[PDB]
Amino acid sequence: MAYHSFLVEPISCHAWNKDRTQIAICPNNHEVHIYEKSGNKWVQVHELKEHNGQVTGVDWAPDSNRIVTCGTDRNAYVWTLKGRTWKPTLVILRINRAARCVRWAPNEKKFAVGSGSRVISICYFEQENDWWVCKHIKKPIRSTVLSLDWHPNSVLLAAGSCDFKCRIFSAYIKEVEERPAPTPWGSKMPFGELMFESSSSCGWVHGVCFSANGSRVAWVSHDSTVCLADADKKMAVATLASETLPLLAVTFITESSLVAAGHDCFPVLFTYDSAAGKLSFGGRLDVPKQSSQRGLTARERFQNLDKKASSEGSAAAGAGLDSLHKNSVSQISVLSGGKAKCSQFCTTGMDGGMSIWDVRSLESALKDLKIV
Amino acid sequence: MTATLRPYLSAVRATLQAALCLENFSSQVVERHNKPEVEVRSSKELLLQPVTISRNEKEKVLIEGSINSVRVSIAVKQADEIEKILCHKFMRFMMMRAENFFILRRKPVEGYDISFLITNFHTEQMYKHKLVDFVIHFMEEIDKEISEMKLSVNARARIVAEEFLKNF
Amino acid sequence: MAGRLPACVVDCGTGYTKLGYAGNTEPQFIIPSCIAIKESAKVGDQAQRRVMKGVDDLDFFIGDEAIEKPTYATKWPIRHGIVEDWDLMERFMEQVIFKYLRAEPEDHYFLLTEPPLNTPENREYTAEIMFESFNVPGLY
Amino acid sequence: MILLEVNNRIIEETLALKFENAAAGNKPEAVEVTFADFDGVLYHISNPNGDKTKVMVSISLKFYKELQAHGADELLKRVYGSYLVNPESGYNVSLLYDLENLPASKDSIVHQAGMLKRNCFASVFEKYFQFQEEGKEGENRAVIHYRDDETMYVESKKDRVTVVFSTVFKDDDDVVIGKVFMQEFKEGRRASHTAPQVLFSHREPPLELKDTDAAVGDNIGYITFVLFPRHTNASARDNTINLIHTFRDYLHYHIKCSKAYIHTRMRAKTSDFLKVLNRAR
Amino acid sequence: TTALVCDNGSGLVKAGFAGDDAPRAVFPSIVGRPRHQGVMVGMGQKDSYVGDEAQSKRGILTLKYPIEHGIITNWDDMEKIWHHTFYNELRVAPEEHPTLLTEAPLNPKANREKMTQIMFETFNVPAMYVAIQAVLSLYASGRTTGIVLDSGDGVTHNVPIYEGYALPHAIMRLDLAGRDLTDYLMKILTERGYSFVTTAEREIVRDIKEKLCYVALDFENEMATAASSSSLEKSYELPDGQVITIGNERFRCPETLFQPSFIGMESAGIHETTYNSIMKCDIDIRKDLYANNVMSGGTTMYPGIADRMQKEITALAPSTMKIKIIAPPERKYSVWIGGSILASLSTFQQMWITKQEYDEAGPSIVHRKCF
Amino acid sequence: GPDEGEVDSCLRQGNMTAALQAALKNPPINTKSQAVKDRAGSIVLKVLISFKANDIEKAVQSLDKNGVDLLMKYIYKGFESPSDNSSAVLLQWHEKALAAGGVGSIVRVLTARKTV
C-alpha cells in the first residue's frame, strides 16, 4: 500500500506499544531514538542510551509497557515509560558477552533468554533482589539461542539454537511457577529438561513458530530449511528447504499457511494440510511500490561525464535488487486482523522507512488440514 | 562468443543467489570482534561448504565460506613465462591499488592465479545485486584487458629496431 | 670493496641533488632536481592507443638546462605533495647515471638517502627496479 | 632526449675549469677519480706528481693484454702524443696534464683528449680498414674479451671491413624479440635505407672464426657487422663507429627506459579499474 | 565444435565458421582513428572507429590501406582488428580452434614467417594451414577445372586450373582493384563545376557508382548519346538535404578497364591483357575452354560489362566452339562460402602446421626457402 | 554403492536415461572412505561424459527431485576435478539439472552434512 523513511535509520529491529504507535528501534551502533505514528508521519518521541550494548532484540510487553531490553551488555533492563522517558529497570543474569533475544512467558510470568554464553539464563523476578535473578541451563544444552517461542500455556517453550539439534524443552522455576500440563512431545516438565527432538542438527534453527494454537510448530534454520513438528499426527515432523535467497524470517498466518522472506526481499507464501513431510509453497506475495515512469535526464547527463555506476540497469530500481527492494529489506509483521483474518501487514528495511501492505486481495480460499 | 561462460557465470550467480548468506553475530563463547571468519573457521554445521569448480582442465575457481565471510581464488589456462612474468610486472603494480579497493585476499595466489576476501560489511555499506552483477563480470573484463596489454606489449616489442636502427 | 667498482654517494635532495666521485674530497655537484615536458594539453590528431611501437611522439629534457625549455613545464620530482612521479624518477636517474655521470650501476656500489617520515611502497616498487632495472650489486 | 658524447661532461668542464685555473695560476683542491663507462672502463683522474700544478687521467682494463698486441699506438702518438705524458702504475696507460703540459689555446685538446676512448678503438680498427684496402682476407683478427658472457673479433676481407660477436641469452622474454626484430632488419631496411650489414644471430657465428648455429636453437646472439665501402670511405665510417662503441650496452639500458615508460599506460589502466570498481553501487 | 574460416582479406571482412552457408562477420577491411583535437576532452572515447563505426564517424578519422608494393605493409594495424575480430566481432580465442588462414600468389619473401610469428606466438592456434583463394569459388560450383577470374578491392588474378596442376606461367596475378578506380573518376567534379569534392566523398562516389553505374555497351554510341542526351543523368541525395543529378560519367569512367591509357598508362585493356594467359596456356584445350569461363567479384556486379566483355573477348577469339561463361548470382559474396564448406572434407586439415612445428625450429619449419 | 556392469548395460544398450538412474543408485554417502566415493564419482562422470546434449534433458526429466539433488552433489563432485574439458559437458548437464531442480538444488548441496 504505502511507505516512507522520515529518516534513513538502519532499523535493525522494531517494537511497540500494542496500538503500534511508538516505534522503538535497534539503531546503528549504540544510539536510540524512539519515533511515533504522527497520523502516518514519523516523528521523534524519545532518546534512549543506557542499555549500552548496542541493541539486539527486546520484549516490549506491549499492554503493560515493559521493554525488557537486550544486547552486548548486562546493563539489560525492563525499560518502562516512567511517564518521562522509557528508562531502565535492571535484570540479573549469568549469561556472558551479550543477550540476543528475550521472550515473555506469554502470560508475562517471566521471560526466556538467548545468551552470548552457550546458555539459557532462565531469569525470574525477585522483589528481594529489587530486580530479576537467574538459574542456568548451561547443560544439557551445548550452545546458545537465536529465536524463541513459548507454547501458549506459557511455562512450555520452543527455541532456535546454535546447538542445532531441534529440541523441545521445559524450564519451570519453583520460586515463580508450577510445572506445566502433560506435554505430548514429552511430559518430564521440571527445570532444564528435554521433551522431544527432531534429529535435525540441520543448520542453526533461526525461526520457530507455533500454529495458531501451537498444536503443531514450524521451524526454519538460517541455512534455510523449512520444517515442522505436529503432535496430533503422533509427534510427527516435517522438513524441506526453499528455492530462493536465504531467510530473514518466517511466520504462521494460520495452522496451515505461513509467510516466509529472505535476501530476495519479497515475501513468499507457504501452504499445508497434515500430510507429515508434505511441506508446500504458494508463490511470491508482494507487488512493487514503484512504476516505470521514474527518471531525470539532466542529472543522468551531468553524471555521465562523471561515471559512478554510470552504466544503467533495473537492479538500480531496487538499489541493486530491482523491485524497490533496496540495499536490503530487514523485517516483516502483521499490523491487524492477525494469523487468521489479517486486514493490514508491514515491513522494515535498511532505508529506514515504514511500509504497509496489500493483504485481503489474497483472501480467496476456504479451510485447511488433512490427517496424512 | 565463449557461450558456456553463460552456464558458467549464471551458475556462479545461481550459487550467489542460493547462498547470498553473509550476515552477522559477534559472540557466544569467544569475543564480539567479528573476525576474518573464513580464515578462523573452527567447525562445519554453522557455515557454508568449502568448494572448487573447474571451467575445463587448467581453469577453475575456489570458493570457501564461513556463513559471514568468504574466499575466492581463480585459475587460468596460461603458463608461459611470457604470459606470466610480464603480466606480473602488473600483478606487482596491482597490489597497492588493492589497498585502494579493500576486498582482495591480496596475492596472485598459485594453483589458482589470485585470491579474494569477502564479508557481510559490504552488504550493509551501499547497495544490492547490481554489486555482484558488476563484480562477477568485471572480473572477466579485467581478463579481456589482458588482450589490451597484449597488443600494447607486443607493440613494445615493435619499439625495437623502430628506434635503434630507424635512427638511420 | 667493489662490484668491479667501489661505492659512491648521492644525496637525493628535495631541492637539489648532490654527489662526487671515488677519490675526490667534495660533492663535485649540488644541482637542480628538475625536468621539462610540454603539458600544454591540446591532445589531438591521427589517434592511436594500446600499442607501444617505435615512437615519433616524445618531447622532453632533464636537469638544470631543462629550466630554459619553453612550453616544457620544468617539473621537480622533489617531494612536496608531488610524490607520484617516482615513476619518472627512474627514467630521470637512468639519464643521470648513464648519460650525465656517464656511468655503470651494475659495476659500482651505492649509498642513497631518504627522509624519516618515508612510507614503504614508493621505495619497495623501486626495489625491483634497483635490482632488475638498475640491477645493482649492492646499495642501501 | 637520450644522447651522449665520447669526451665526458664530468671531465671536460672540470679540467677546462682547471685549465682556466692554470691560465690564472690558481692553487689546487683534492681530486682523485676512478669510474666506469661502456666497454668495461676503469677511468681515473688525479693530482699526480704531488704538487699544486699537475693533473693525470689514467685507465685500466684486463683485455688490454689482447690489445697492446696490436699497433694502435701510432695514431695515438699523433693525436695525444702531441701532449707530453707517461703511463701510471695499475693503469694500462695515463695522460699527465701537467699544467705546464698545457698550450696557449688550452681548449683545443680538451674535446679530443676526452673522445680518446672510441678514438683508441678506431686507432686499431684502421688496420682492418687497411687490410680491406690492401685486398686482404682473414688478416690479423683482434679477438678481444671486453666481455665473456659474450665474444668478439675484428677482421678483414677485400670488399668489406668486419666485426663478429657472441652473447648468451638470459631470458626467453628477450629471445622472443631477439629472434624476430633483427629479422625485420636482416629483412627490413626501406625506411632506414642506409645500413651496412648487421646480422644478429640467435645461434650463428661466422665460419673463419667460429661456426654457424652454435646456440640452443636461439639462446646465443652471435651478432656480426660488415661494411660496404659506402661506409669504408674516409667519412661515413666515423658516424657509425660511434654508435657501435655503445650500441647493445646502450640499447640494453634503453630497454629499461621503455620498461619504466609502460607504467603510464599501466597508471592510467590501474587507475581506470579503480574507477570501474565503484560501479557495483 | 569449430574450426575457423574467414575472409581475412580486402573489401569487407567476410568471415564465419567452417561449413556455413554464409560469411557473417562483416565490416570494411579498413578503419579510422580521430584526425582531431578532441575538444570535448575526456568524453570517454577510444582512439578508433572501425569499418562500420569508421563510416558512422568518417568525418572524424585518419584511415589506412598501405603501399602498392602489397595491399598493405603495416599489417600490424590489422593488429587492432585481430582483436576487433576476436572480441569485437566474436568474443573467442583463435588459440582454441584449428584455423584456416589464407594468402595470395607471389607474396614477396618475408610474409609467412612474419605472419606465423603472430599466428602461433600470439594467436596460438592448435594447428593451421594457409590457402590460396581461387578454387574456393569452384568448390561452391562443385568444379575443379576451367579459367577463374578474380577482380576485387585488394587485387586481381586470372587462374587456369585442371583438377590441380594450375599454371605457374599462365596464371596471371595483378595489383588491380575497385580500390583504384576513383582517381580518374573524381577529377570530373571540376567538369561538374562542384567547388566541393573531397577524400571522404570518395565513398559516396563509389556509392552512386555502386547504385547506378554500368559499363558502356559500345562506347562511341554512348559518347554520341551523351553528346545528345541526359536521361543518363540520375538523382542522388547528399547529407545536408541536397541532391546531385549526374550520370554520363556513370559509364564514361567505366571505360578505363579497356583504357588504362587514360592516365597515359601503357597497359592494354582488360580482355586483351587477359588473353595472354590462354596464349601461354596449352593450345589444345582452347576449344574445350569455351565451356569453362568462370568469373566473379564485387567488382563484377555491374550491368553492360558482361555482353561487352564477351564481344570484346570475341574480337580476340575464333568462333568455332561451344561457349559457356560462368558468373553466378552473388558471385561477389560467394567465395567465403565455398572455402567455409571445404573443411567438411576434413582431409583439408591434414596439411596443418601445428604450433609444435612452428615452435621447434621456428616457422623455419615451413616459411619461404620452402616452396 | 553403484554397479559398474548395470550402468554399462544401460549405457551400451543406448538406455542413457537408465544409465543415469542406475549410476545414481545406492550412493556411497554413509562410507567415510573417499576411495569408494570416487569410484561412484568415476561411474557417474563416465555416464556424464558419454551423453548427448539433446538426450540430457530427456534423462533429467525422468529423475525425481531427490535424484536431481543427488545429481547436483555429483555435478559438484565432477567440478572439483578439471581435466579433458569435463567441466564443459558438466556445464551443459548443470543447465538442465538447474532447470529441473531450481536453485534450491544448489542450496541443498551447500547444506549437506555428508555427501558423494
Numbering used by the authors:
A (entry chain c): 1 to 372
B (entry chain f): 1 to 168
C (entry chain a): 1 to 140
D (entry chain d): 1 to 281
E (entry chain p): 5 to 375
F (entry chain g): 36 to 151
Question: What text appears in the publication on this structure?
Answer:
Spontaneous actin filament polymerization is a kinetically unfavorable process and nucleation factors are required to overcome this rate-limiting step in actin filament assembly. The heptameric 224 kDa Arp2/3 complex, consisting of the two actin-related proteins 2 and 3 (Arp2 and Arp3), and five additional subunits ArpC1-5, generates branched actin networks by inducing the formation of so-called actin filament Arp2/3 complex branch junctions on preexisting actin filaments. The Arp2/3 complex plays a role in both physiological and pathological processes, such as lamellipodial protrusion, vesicle trafficking, and also the motility of various pathogens. Details on the conformation of the Arp2/3 complex within the branch, and its interaction with the mother and daughter filament were largely derived from fitting high-resolution x-ray crystallography models of the inactive complex into low-resolution in vitro electron microscopy (EM) and electron tomography (ET) reconstructions, as well as molecular dynamics (MD) simulations. These studies led to the model that upon activation, the Arp2 and Arp3 subunits reposition into a short-pitch conformation resembling an actin filament-like state, providing the basis for further actin polymerization.
Here we report, using cryo-ET and STA on lamellipodia of fibroblast cells, a 9 Å structure of the actin filament Arp2/3 complex branch junction. In order to further optimize conditions for image processing, we used established extraction and fixation protocols involving the actin-stabilizing toxin phalloidin to remove the plasma membrane, while stabilizing actin filaments, allowing for a better visualization of actin filaments and bound complexes. Overall, our model reveals the conformation of in total 18 protein subunits (the heptameric Arp2/3 complex and 11 actin filament subunits); however, the resolution of our structure did not allow deriving unambiguous side chain information. The biggest change upon branch junction formation was the actin-like heterodimer arrangement of Arp2 and Arp3, which resembles the first two subunits of the daughter filament. Specifically, in the branch junction, we observe a significant movement of ArpC3 toward the D-loop of Arp2 providing additional stabilization to the active conformation. To derive a more accurate description of interaction interfaces between the Arp2/3 complex and the mother actin filament in our model, we probed for C-alpha atoms of Arp2/3 complex subunits and actin filament subunits being in vicinity closer than 10 Å.
